[PDB]
């Protein structure tokens, strides 16, 4: 009969689902609430504990996904989902739910490691349900937990002061971790060993939680898949007031004072705010006006509660969580996904340095490279061959290095120097679950490490023997690290700790170790921005 | 040295004299004259009506609003097409049926110059008349240039497929405007016996429509369709339209009980509301999710029974159109950079392999209308010859272009020809200096690249070579001559062969010389493939 | 480098403004929150502590003024302002701020006397920003604090029971005094010597705080200028339910229960409420209807928290916590300003016994004189002369005595008989800063003392030496009082204590003691009022 777990707030009811090659069925709990629904007055304020219930809560229905662009959410979800068919989602502000996938034997009393996944999506789109944690849970025998946090205006609108500090979405993730620290045992998970991991916005968040005091003791290992707290685009530095006003005004609200804007914004309907989010055209590159005045998304800010100062200023202080940290990236972070999902101006694969300098400028909101520095940057990259077909491919590398590549290593380095176990990797593979509209040449595009990490090859039909092999290995590494803080294991290519040798593991069809990841680009960029 | 005041049928109007360099005869210009009663409230979704006459002197010295459309989407298109040194930022309004007039005629003496009436493009979803300044062309060719606006998007094209909201509103505004010119143009020095309508893309398809419309009879005399015709698969919606109307009704939060109900409901929605519905529909962008066949990129022309009595195909199939000089033309790379860029096309890698090729061609159903089974065969008839990754991408755009504009144009042209009416074709191949910076030097003859010549931008915008300047001068001369004799050929100009049985046309560009059989082989393959 | 102070709730960044003849520049702090913005839920409820902030609250721009009729607000700020230029302001419900002008050297420890100013405006309009405390703070070297409090419907609506007690404005004022107790120390001010002062409705408020247990230890010196707790127009005795019903009906609300009205009004927008204020056409003499019903102001009430009994009853009981109270009036309280701004039907400058009687009756809301007694009052005042000119002057004297004259003196005497130090004055002077439309014949009009108390001669242009002297003297008198409970000091004419001799100071061109101020008046009115 159905699994029933007794949590602090009440009894939850799930469902048993076994996986091929596994006698033990995983116990799936869909839609467990960890916070009071963030409605009306609770909008733009930290999350509050959830109220308890009297009987047995039926946790077997996919919770709604946090309000967001309905078409963006769906497209993105179809792309990264590791399921056979993408599960259609309903929008709601009442979306602080998390899903539990546990292989543990609920009759006895186990303590399996807990891996908490924070989806990516730009703090704008994304859903937890997009990722099914059956395969990973079954194969590596760990308790997977997919959590949701507030997105867009709802989760990151800030006035720069006490009237609306911001990072509501992040305080949610903290609340989520805190909920796991209190109830996970009930599901066979060991609260003493929680690993947080995510990609893109998820990775950036993981990185932010390593830096925040509100997160200490809530996790013991961290993995950052293609995204950190130095990916400038997601982190809002300097005065944010203008952006709050731009939104307030668009939502049709006065801007007399901070208290007034936030008060007028809580009055808007979910529908209303969505229409503003739509008018704002986030997650899309503006081709008119000054790129500096453009703002693709509402992200993390230095509220003074979660983050007490710029990540950069923090790392320098060596003041943060010195827990095992695994940072990684993919060979072509700007391969096709991001650009295709941001309406990037690129059709002809022919790209001249002139036209190249123009986009690099229009890309300001992504790369943030002062105009008078564009020529030196474009040169160091496209100055190679006179091949206009090779320049655009190199141009794409330029973006990737700035947005993800360089930031990652810098984080990796400082964490390293902070006296803690560090790990790095470079994912270079091309899954057959990639969209048809994706060129066969793009290998290691954004989010390609997801299918391996989440055992897509056991949930989807059609994988190759190679892919299947890759996934197992990747899931193996991730799990080991989840319990030891060291990915190394038997029958797995040795993964070098990231020390002064700067050794990482090149994960791909062929997975060997290497050294000096992006050594030159780091130096090159660290210099130019220091100009 | 006092301002030019002209008396129209509905009252006096007051413009301003402006002179272009090198021209002694100044140009009298009028901005925002109303050619119809503002289509507000009850007038939404209904034929345009005569403007209300005024008592004193109307100030026609300021630019008029552009019809409600995607603000960001319209301004963007206006910066990329404007022939002015600095783009004019415009305001949105349902009260948008105005027209700007530029006449080099000496208002004191009784003049009767040819009248060229423009019709802006923009997928019948965006665009404004104030973007195409008409000074240069008037001054340089002594022709009265009129630029007109017309209801766009929902406002100008919503249809329930029956009487309650036939459709074509915008096209009727266009007629209304032509009607206006007839009754008032003489006051501005024009000759209502020589009206040439011309437009680019949506503007061009509109011209080919009017040429096919009875309600346009006796309203224009020469016609020029620049890269867009009545057969451009994507602007003319054949089949049951009811589904679209309902999807739209439903988005604006309206019932679908009856056509009557939907229409009435929508009529009470505020301008803002419809604008939010337009955004939500996310028009003029390629839908990569769902079923490509259900995708609907833009509301367009429909067979209503008032403007169009049968399908464009049927009308030109019989001799049910007007035998007036018609100049049809296309650009070298219609699907070069502009359109794709502006529809969010996925091409980051800039190179495609057969597979991904047939794939995307499918998502492109609304733009090319090719069944899933035909996709493979067509993709090979284009991307097979070579096994080069980027050459396929290039050859892949040709595909779309030939289907969208190339083929249609020739067919529209051949028919007119076979109708006994004088026809003329051309192919613009040239990369203007005023091209978007984000545009690769590799794109030549992209969509609307010919607009900079036609309107003589090299005389308003700065930084142009002797080449460009000479090209604009040649184009304008060709157009104007056409608008004067219905024959572009004139003194000191390459010979432009008439598009008769030998299929001669003009390849315009740095090197401008005649050629024959334009897209003859493309016409064959497609005419063939769409025949199952 | 601008001055930065740490208050209990966070760092504030102000600005240094030097004044002529004085070294130590003044530290000016504008728009400091002393309470959580009374919005939504909080509308019509006690004022609340503000939320602490995280970095440095930059306070170098004037706060909004509590929603009120814009026109009335601005015209008044114009006439009462002591600044070279009148600063236009923004209306907002988010208005609970206060400005500070500290001449202390924040780098060293200081304990200078604190003078809290409560602006007048009939409790319907007014703003703290109107009064620049530069001159006073520097010349007398005291810390001037200008506070704001809710106005009109927002600050004084009540149903005469628990659902909306009323007196929200005064609670805001007491709230500001509490802030000053816990913060001014950080601004060189002594929280053990806080003096409150205000004129008109402000003087009445100070007069109310003086009588309320809620303020017991928030001030140690009080000063009422033209307005006291007995100025009947500003206090609502009896059943207030009819005015709350009228307001609700006009606001478009039902009148089913006290709880219902409150709730419905609490759901209307800021604008919908402002419009109600406008439709009620407050602060204007109601020429139509029964005088007795017209409500020109929405004022103080016997809520039960702030005021436990009527002002009159509270003066009887001789409480054990007392302070030095200064009470003063001007020579022509109802001279020009007030009736000019209330659209008084006194336009032919003349007046006969019959027309006076008619005018007095309509004045019921201001003088509260029964119809049966009008003749006695009217004859007792205009029966002296024979010409309609002097008769009119005497009519403006009747009103003035009923409104401030007698009430004031009754308040002073009771304070005296209670055992605390009392002082009075009658200001007689026509400041050069008067309004062009004010005829030169009016001397000691309402509010004319303001320019002397705030040193307009040191901020505004063209003051004669005599005016400049009068200001220096007034300020010193006010300061000596602020730090002694006695205004006397070296270089100043003598001010006698207001004891059984009823000695008071006559301030003006020529300043000197006198006795029995308004003595006979207080007599004629006390008796007649008991008929
Ligand atoms: C599914 C959405 C498309 N997709 C475009 C590309 C790359 C990335 C991104 C977006 C918008 C602006 C960016 O700068 C940016 O960088 C990435 C990131 O870190 C998280 C969010 C995001 O995954 C998302 C939108
Ligand atoms: C944001 C860009 C503007 N946006 C949408 C307007 C209408 C349309 C268009 C453009 C430029 C020139 C046109 O003639 C034209 O018609 C439309 C079409 O068919 C495809 C491309 C396009 O969707 C795009 C740019
Ligand atoms: C339109 C409002 C009427 N208007 C101007 C009359 C005179 C005065 C006043 C009021 C109410 C009660 C008074 O005692 C009183 O005196 C004046 C003052 O000092 C400030 C406020 C005020 O300007 C206001 C209301
Ligand atoms: C708590 C509750 O709602 N009860 C439901 C029950 O009706 C349903 O049969 C079962 C499976 O669907 O899940 C549970
Ligand atoms: C009523 C109106 O539109 N105002 C116009 C003004 O904009 C213009 O500048 C002026 C002269 O051109 O004539 C008038
Ligand atoms: C009074 C005024 O605003 N001046 C403008 C003038 O600058 C402008 O050139 C003219 C035509 O647009 O309209 C008017
Ligand atoms: C560092 C900073 O933001 N300085 C601002 C200043 O520019 C502004 O004039 C003032 C009032 O708005 O507040 C402060």
Report which DSSP code applies to B404.
Answer: I
**C-alpha C60 to ligand 7 mean position (Å):** 7
The verdict on a CB contact (< 8 Å) between C54 and A256 is no
Angle at the Cα of B468 from the Cα atoms of B465 and B474, rounded to 5 degrees: 140
Q: Which helix (H) or strand (E) holds B389?
A: helix B389-401
Q: Which helix (H) or strand (E) holds B13?
A: strand B11-14
Which residues lie closer than 8 Å to A520 by C-beta, 6 or more apart?
A: none
Using DSSP's 3-state secondary structure scheme, residue A57 falls into strand
The verdict on a CB contact (< 8 Å) between A347 and B76 is no
Q: Considering only alpha carbons, which residue of chain C is nearest residue A163?
A: C51
Q: At what angle do helices B169-184 and B202-212 cross, to 10 degrees?
A: 70
- Closest by CA to C208, choosing from C175, C172, C235, is C235
CA B505/CA B513 separation, integer angstroms: 9
Q: Considering only alpha carbons, which residue of chain A is nearest residue C35?
A: A259
Q: Which one of the ligands is nearest to A300 CA? A: 1
Q: Is the minimum distance from the CB of B201 to ligand 2 under 6 angstroms?
A: yes
- Closest by CA to B147, choosing from B168, B126, B178, B123, is B178
8 A C-beta contact, residue A43 and residue A154: yes
DSSP string of B250-309, one letter each residue: HHTS---S-HHHHHHHHHHS-HHHHHHHHHHHT-SS---SS-TTT------B---SSS-S
The verdict on a CB contact (< 8 Å) between C57 and A161 is yes
Q: Could you tell me which residues are beta bridge partners of residue A18?
A: A25
CA end-to-end distance (rounded Å), chain C = 67
Give how far Cα B362 sits from Cα of B275, B351, B369, B502, Å. 29, 17, 9, 36
- Closest by CA to B279, choosing from B467, B126, B88, is B126
Q: Measure CB to CB from residue C64 to each of A161, A165, A257 and give the nearest one.
A: A257
CA B241/CA B259 separation, integer angstroms: 12
Q: Which helix (H) or strand (E) holds B58?
A: strand B57-59
- Closest by CA to B115, choosing from B133, B137, B94, B95, is B137
Q: Could you tell me which residues are beta bridge partners of residue A102?
A: A27
Please report the beta strands in A110-178, taking only residues with DSSP state E, as ranges in sequence order. 112-118, 143-147
CA C408/CA B134 separation, integer angstroms: 78
Q: Which one of the ligands is nearest to B128 CA? A: 2
- Beta pairing class for B190-200 and B326-331: unpaired
8 A C-beta contact, residue B334 and residue B427: no
Q: Which helix (H) or strand (E) holds C524?
A: helix C519-528
Q: In angstroms, how far is CA B63 from the centroid of its own chain?
A: 20
C482-490 long-range contacts, Cβ below 8 Å, gap at least 24?
C482/C113, C482/C114, C482/C115, C482/C140, C482/C142, C482/C193, C482/C195, C482/C221, C483/C113, C483/C142, C483/C193, C485/C220, C485/C221, C485/C323, C485/C324, C485/C421, C486/C324, C486/C421, C487/C326, C487/C423
Q: Is the minimum distance from the CB of A127 to ligand 1 under 6 angstroms?
A: no
8 A C-beta contact, residue C367 and residue C331: no
CA C37/CA C148 separation, integer angstroms: 12
Residues in chain C: 531
Nearest CA to ligand 3 atom 21: C121
Q: How many helices and strands in chain A, by DSSP H and E? A: 18, 16
Using DSSP's 3-state secondary structure scheme, residue B191 falls into strand
- Closest by CA to B356, choosing from A388, A72, A81, A441, is A441
Which two structure tokens, joined as six digits, stand for C227? 């307005």
Considering only CB atoms, which chain A residues are within 8 Å of B284? none
CA A32/CA A96 separation, integer angstroms: 8
Give how far Cα B367 sits from Cα of A115, A194, A364, B232, B289, Å. 46, 51, 32, 9, 15
Using DSSP's 3-state secondary structure scheme, residue A272 falls into helix
Residue linked to tokens 């301003």? B16
Q: Please indicate if any CB of chain A lies within 8 Å of the CB of C54.
A: yes
CA C12/CA C31 separation, integer angstroms: 10
Count of A-B CB contacts under 8 Å: 112
Q: Please indicate if any CB of chain A lies within 8 Å of the CB of C55.
A: yes
CA A253/CA B39 separation, integer angstroms: 30
8 A C-beta contact, residue B188 and residue B28: yes
Q: Which of C193, C446, C452, C521 is catalytic?
A: C446
The verdict on a CB contact (< 8 Å) between C53 and A161 is yes
Residues in chain B: 532
**Cα dihedral C332→C335→C341→C342 (10° resolution):** 100
Q: Please indicate if any CB of chain B lies within 8 Å of the CB of A442.
A: yes
Closest-CA distance of chain B to residue A454, Å: 24
CA C419/CA B317 separation, integer angstroms: 111
A471 is catalytic: no
Q: Which helix (H) or strand (E) holds B140?
A: helix B135-141
Considering only CB atoms, which chain B residues are within 8 Å of A347? 336-337, 340-341, 345, 347, 350, 397
CA B429/CA B54 separation, integer angstroms: 47
The verdict on a CB contact (< 8 Å) between C94 and A162 is no
Q: Which ligand 4 atom lies nearest to the CA of residue A57?
A: 1
Angle at the Cα of B389 from the Cα atoms of B387 and B395, rounded to 5 degrees: 80
Q: What are phi and psi of A357, to 5 degrees?
A: -70, -30
H helical segments located in B318-353: 338-341
Report which DSSP code applies to C75.
Answer: H
Residue linked to tokens 């930065």? C4
Q: Which one of the ligands is nearest to A3 CA? A: 4
Which two structure tokens, joined as six digits, stand for B482? 């056409």
CA C402/CA C382 separation, integer angstroms: 15
- Closest by CA to C337, choosing from C146, C151, C507, C200, is C200
Q: How many CB atoms lie under 10 A from the CB of residue B492? A: 6
Considering only CB atoms, which chain C residues are within 8 Å of A260? 37, 39, 92-94
Q: Which helix (H) or strand (E) holds A210?
A: helix A201-211
Which residues lie closer than 8 Å to B527 by C-beta, 6 or more apart?
A: B407, B411
H helical segments located in A238-387: 241-250, 258-265, 270-280, 311-317, 337-340, 353-362, 364-367, 374-382
8 A C-beta contact, residue B499 and residue B413: yes
Give how far Cα A328 sits from Cα of A228, A507, C81, Å. 10, 10, 64
8 A C-beta contact, residue B68 and residue B277: no
Q: Which one of the ligands is nearest to A54 CA? A: 4
CA C475/CA C137 separation, integer angstroms: 10
8 A C-beta contact, residue A219 and residue A244: no
List all residues whose CB is within 6 A of at least one atom of ligand 4: A 56, 58
The verdict on a CB contact (< 8 Å) between B349 and A74 is no
CA B444/CA B432 separation, integer angstroms: 8
Q: Is the minimum distance from the CB of C61 to ligand 7 under 6 angstroms?
A: yes
Alpha-carbon radius of gyration of chain C: 22
Nearest CA to ligand 7 atom 9: C60
Q: Please indicate if any CB of chain A lies within 8 Å of the CB of B19.
A: no
CA B419/CA B317 separation, integer angstroms: 10
CA A415/CA A418 separation, integer angstroms: 5
Report which DSSP code applies to B52.
Answer: P
CA B336/CA B332 separation, integer angstroms: 8
Subunits that touch chain C (at least 3 Cβ pairs < 8 angstroms)?
Answer: A
What part of B 259-318 touches A (C-beta under 8 Å)?
276, 279-280, 282, 288-289
- Domains defined along chain C, listed by start: 1-531 (3.40.50.1820)
CA B271/CA C508 separation, integer angstroms: 64
The verdict on a CB contact (< 8 Å) between C94 and A303 is no
8 A C-beta contact, residue A400 and residue A417: no
**C-alpha B280 to ligand 1 mean position (Å):** 21
Which two structure tokens, joined as six digits, stand for B302? 């429909």
Which two structure tokens, joined as six digits, stand for A8? 């602090």
Nearest CA to ligand 3 atom 6: C338
DSSP string of C286-304, one letter each residue: --SS-GGG------EE--S
Q: How many CB atoms lie under 10 A from the CB of residue B346? A: 24
The verdict on a CB contact (< 8 Å) between A440 and B356 is yes
Q: What are phi and psi of C385, to 5 degrees?
A: -80, -170
- Closest by CA to B451, choosing from B20, B83, B116, is B83
CA A498/CA A515 separation, integer angstroms: 9
**C-alpha A223 to ligand 1 mean position (Å):** 19
Q: Please indicate if any CB of chain C lies within 8 Å of the CB of A43.
A: no
Residue linked to tokens 């290039």? B394
C333 is catalytic: yes
CA A39/CA C485 separation, integer angstroms: 54
Which two structure tokens, joined as six digits, stand for C324? 């030095």
Closest-CA distance of chain A to residue B353, Å: 7
CA B463/CA B468 separation, integer angstroms: 10
Q: Please indicate if any CB of chain A lies within 8 Å of the CB of B438.
A: yes
CB-neighbour burial class of residue B271 (10 A; exposed 0-12, middle 13-18, buried 19+): middle
Q: Is the minimum distance from the CB of C203 to ligand 3 under 6 angstroms?
A: no
Nearest CA to ligand 2 atom 19: B123
CB-neighbour burial class of residue C109 (10 A; exposed 0-12, middle 13-18, buried 19+): exposed
Subunits that touch chain B (at least 3 Cβ pairs < 8 angstroms)?
Answer: A
The verdict on a CB contact (< 8 Å) between C54 and A163 is no
Q: What are phi and psi of C328, to 5 degrees?
A: -140, 160
Give how far Cα B322 sits from Cα of B193, B273, C245, Å. 16, 40, 75
Alpha-carbon radius of gyration of chain A: 22
8 A C-beta contact, residue A378 and residue A394: no
Closest-CA distance of chain A to residue C268, Å: 12
8 A C-beta contact, residue B397 and residue B340: yes
SS3 labels along C333-395 = CCCCHHHHHCCCCCCCCCCCHHHHHHHHHHCHHHHCCCHHHHHHHHHHHHCCCCCHHHHHHHH
Q: How many CB atoms lie under 10 A from the CB of residue A273? A: 21
DSSP string of A16-42, one letter each residue: EEE-TT-SSEEEEEEEEE-S----GGG
Alpha-carbon radius of gyration of chain B: 22
Considering only CB atoms, which chain B residues are within 8 Å of A358? 437-438
With the most atoms of ligand 4 within 8 angstroms of its CB, the residue from A58, A59, A61, A62 to mutate is: A58
Which two structure tokens, joined as six digits, stand for C495? 């001010």
Q: Please indicate if any CB of chain B lies within 8 Å of the CB of A344.
A: yes
Query: Do B and C share at least 3 CB pairs under 8 Å?
Result: no
Considering only CB atoms, which chain A residues are within 8 Å of C94? 256-257, 259-260, 263
CA C461/CA C84 separation, integer angstroms: 7
3-state helix, strand, coil split of chain B in percent (to 5) is: 35, 15, 45
B334 is catalytic: yes
How many CA atoms are closer than 13 Å to the CA of C346, on its beta-carbon side? 31
- Beta pairing class for C422-428 and C325-330: parallel
CA A173/CA A146 separation, integer angstroms: 11
Q: Considering only alpha carbons, which residue of chain A is nearest residue C63?
A: A257
Q: Which helix (H) or strand (E) holds C97?
A: strand C97-102
How many CA atoms are closer than 13 Å to the CA of C186, on its beta-carbon side? 18
Burial C177-197 (b: 16+ CB within 10 A, else e): bbbbbebbbebbbbeebbbbb
**Cα dihedral A419→A420→A421→A422 (10° resolution):** -90
CA C345/CA B329 separation, integer angstroms: 80
Q: Please indicate if any CB of chain A lies within 8 Å of the CB of C37.
A: yes
Q: What are phi and psi of A297, to 5 degrees?
A: -165, 155
With the most atoms of ligand 1 within 8 angstroms of its CB, the residue from A341, A407, A447 to mutate is: A341
């Amino acid at each position: 009969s159905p699994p029933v777990v007794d949590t602090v707030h009440g009894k939850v009811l799930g469902k048993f689902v076994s996986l091929e090659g596994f006698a033990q069925p995983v116990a799936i709990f869909l839609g467990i609430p960890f916070a009071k629904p963030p409605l009306g007055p609770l909008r733009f304020t930290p999350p509050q504990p959830a109220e308890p219930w009297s009987f047995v809560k039926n946790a077997t229905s996919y919770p709604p996904m946090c309000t967001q662009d309905p078409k963006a959410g769906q497209l993105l979800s179809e792309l990264f989902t590791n399921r056979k068919e993408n599960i259609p989602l309903k929008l709601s502000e009442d979306c602080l739910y998390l899903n539990i996938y546990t292989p543990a034997d609920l009759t006895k009393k186990n303590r399996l490691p807990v891996m908490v996944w924070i989806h990516g999506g730009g703090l704008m789109v994304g859903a937890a349900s997009t990722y099914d944690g059956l395969a990973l849970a079954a194969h590596e025998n760990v308790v997977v937990v997919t959590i949701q946090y507030r997105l867009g205006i709802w989760g990151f609108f800030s006035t720069g002061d006490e009237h609306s500090r911001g990072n509501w979405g992040h305080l949610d993730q903290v609340a989520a971790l805190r909920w796991v620290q209190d109830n996970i045992a009930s599901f066979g998970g060991n609260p003493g060993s929680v690993t947080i991991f995510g990609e893109s916005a998820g990775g950036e968040s993981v990185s932010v939680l390593v830096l925040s005091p509100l997160a200490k003791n809530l996790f013991h290992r961290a993995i950052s898949e293609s995204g950190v707290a130095l990916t400038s685009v997601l982190v809002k530095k300097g005065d944010v007031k203008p952006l709050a006003e731009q939104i307030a005004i668009t939502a049709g609200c006065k801007t007399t004072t901070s208290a007034v804007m936030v008060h007028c914004l809580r009055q808007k309907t979910e529908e209303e705010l969505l229409e503003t989010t739509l008018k704002m055209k986030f997650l899309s590159l503006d081709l008119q006006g000054d790129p500096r005045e453009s703002q693709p998304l509402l992200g993390t800010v230095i509220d003074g509660m979660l983050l007490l100062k710029t990540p950069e200023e923090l790392q320098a202080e060596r003041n943060f969580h010195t827990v095992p940290y695994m940072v990684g990236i993919n060979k072509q972070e700007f391969g096709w996904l991001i650009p295709m999902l941001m309406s990037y101006p690129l059709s002809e694969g022919q790209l001249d340095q002139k036209t190249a300098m123009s986009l690099l400028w229009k890309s300001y909101p992504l790369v943030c490279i002062a105009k008078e520095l564009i020529p030196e940057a474009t040169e160091k990259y496209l100055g190679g061959t006179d091949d206009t077909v090779k320049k655009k491919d190199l141009f794409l590398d330029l973006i990737a290095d700035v947005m993800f590549g360089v930031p990652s290593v810098i984080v990796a380095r400082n964490h390293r120097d902070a006296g803690a176990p560090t790990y790095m990797y470079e994912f270079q593979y091309r899954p057959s679950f990639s969209s048809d509209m994706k060129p066969k040449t793009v290998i290691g595009d954004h989010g390609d490490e997801l299918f391996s990490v989440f055992g897509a090859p056991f949930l989807k039909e059609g994988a190759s023997e190679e892919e299947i092999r890759l996934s197992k290995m990747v899931m193996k590494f991730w799990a080991n690290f989840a319990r030891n803080g060291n990915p190394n294991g038997e029958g797995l290519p040795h993964w070098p700790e990231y020390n002064q040798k700067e050794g990482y593991l090149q994960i791909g069809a062929n997975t060997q170790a290497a050294q000096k990841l992006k050594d030159k680009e780091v130096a090159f960029w660290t210099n130019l921005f220091a100009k």
